[PDB]
Design an enzyme around this catalytic site. Structure first.
Site, mmCIF file in Angstrom:
data_model
loop_
_atom_site.group_PDB
_atom_site.id
_atom_site.type_symbol
_atom_site.label_atom_id
_atom_site.label_comp_id
_atom_site.label_asym_id
_atom_site.label_seq_id
_atom_site.Cartn_x
_atom_site.Cartn_y
_atom_site.Cartn_z
ATOM 1 N N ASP A 198 76.819 49.239 72.109
ATOM 2 C CA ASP A 198 77.491 48.938 71.046
ATOM 3 C C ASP A 198 77.016 48.056 70.181
ATOM 4 O O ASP A 198 77.505 46.978 69.550
ATOM 5 C CB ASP A 198 78.918 48.486 71.773
ATOM 6 C CG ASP A 198 80.350 48.641 70.832
ATOM 7 O OD1 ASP A 198 80.059 49.307 69.807
ATOM 8 O OD2 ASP A 198 81.142 48.143 71.392
ATOM 9 N N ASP A 231 78.854 40.762 73.310
ATOM 10 C CA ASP A 231 79.432 41.804 74.007
ATOM 11 C C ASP A 231 78.612 42.938 74.727
ATOM 12 O O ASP A 231 78.185 43.772 74.296
ATOM 13 C CB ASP A 231 80.180 42.702 73.084
ATOM 14 C CG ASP A 231 81.770 42.945 73.561
ATOM 15 O OD1 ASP A 231 81.777 43.418 74.512
ATOM 16 O OD2 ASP A 231 82.644 42.592 72.787
#
Ligand SMILES: COC(=O)NC[C@H]1C[C@H](Nc2cc(-c3ccc4cc(C#N)cnn34)ncc2C(=O)NC[C@@H](F)C(C)(C)O)C1
Length: 283
Positions: free
Chosen positions: A140, A158
């Site tokens: 991501d 993240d």
């Protein structure tokens, strides 16, 4: 390793998890795909609190982020402080927020200079390299996941979708505007991280979001073909909110992004070469 918080502590230090924005007087700093980030104060240190479809895989993603963060410590990686098995993750506060918000000058922040943008791109490349060297795939890579500290040093965040390292999955997950074609087909490979970084390099050069519904083109990665088709050049897209950009350095960064955005995964450069090309651009 990390400090197990308790929900009430976070509930207290984040003002009942005030969803109001910081400007009005709340504690909400932003949101992702799996939670909302709140601002808090623990000891006297400012912290970011992430309060996280499928409840059990949300908890696996909780565990994965801790699993990867325990073995991943780098200058260009965010630092996890604790957790809280609602599920919560406490990090060190990043004074300058996300690269996405700074490219947008959100909340009135001054535009990033080309000199700062070059350092940010190098730092993010050093972080991805540390992950790929430890056989981890982020899955991501995007500008909203590249955060900036008190020195505007890039830090990747993240790691909840991270995986160890070509294999295929049944749970395709990511941000469509950043994903390589093989990732959207279900493949899991570090070569997809390179492709997403190339999109980030385009956002850094242009200052444009990766996807905008009210824009032609709606996808940023489609400007590569317009430039390739002699219609435009990279100078028609350079962020005008800069005064220190030179043609050579920008065209140098575009060539890196173009290489990263090769539709064939095996033709893209490894992250080590990306590091090399980004350093030659400034040296
Ligand atoms: C998941 O959703 C997002 O990361 N969304 C992107 C959203 C949240 C992001 N803003 C922040 C994130 C973090 C932070 C520090 C560790 C971590 C770890 C994670 C994780 N995982 C996330 N954030 N984070 N610190 C501070 C901010 C912030 O706004 N400072 C104010 C500053 F900008 C300013 C200029 C004064 O206004 C935009």
């Amino acid at each position: 390793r990390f400090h197990s918080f308790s929900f009430y502590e976070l509930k207290n230090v984040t003002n009942n998890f005030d969803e109001r924005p910081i400007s009005v007087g709340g504690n909400k700093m932003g949101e992702g795909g799996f939670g909302v980030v709140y601002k808090g104060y623990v000891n006297n240190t400012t912290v970011a609190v992430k309060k996280l479809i499928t409840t059990e895989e949300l908890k696996q993603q909780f565990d994965q982020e801790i699993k990867v963060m325990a073995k991943c410590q780098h200058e260009n990686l965010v630092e996890l402080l604790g957790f809280s098995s609602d599920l919560c993750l406490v990090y060190v506060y990043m004074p300058n927020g996300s690269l996405l918000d700074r490219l947008s000058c959100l909340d009135g922040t001054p535009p990033l200079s080309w000199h700062m943008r070059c350092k940010i791109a190098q730092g993010a490349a050093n972080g991805i390299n540390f992950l790929h060297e430890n056989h981890h795939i982020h899955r991501d890579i995007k500008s909203a996941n590249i955060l900036l500290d008190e020195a505007f040093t890039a830090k990747i965040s993240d790691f909840g979708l991270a995986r160890a390292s070509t294999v295929m999955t049944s749970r395709i997950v990511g941000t469509t505007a950043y994903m390589a074609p093989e990732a959207l087909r279900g493949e899991i490979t570090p070569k997809s991280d390179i492709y997403s970084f190339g999109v980030v390099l385009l956002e850094i050069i242009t200052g444009l979001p990766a996807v905008d519904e009210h824009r032609e083109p709606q996808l940023l990665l489609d400007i590569k073909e317009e430039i390739e088709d002699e219609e435009k050049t990279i100078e028609d897209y350079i962020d005008k909110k800069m005064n220190d950009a030179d043609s050579t350095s920008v065209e140098a960064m575009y060539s890196v992004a173009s290489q990263c955005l090769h539709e064939k995964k095996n033709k893209r450069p490894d992250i080590k070469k990306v590091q090399q090309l980004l350093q030659e651009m400034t040296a």
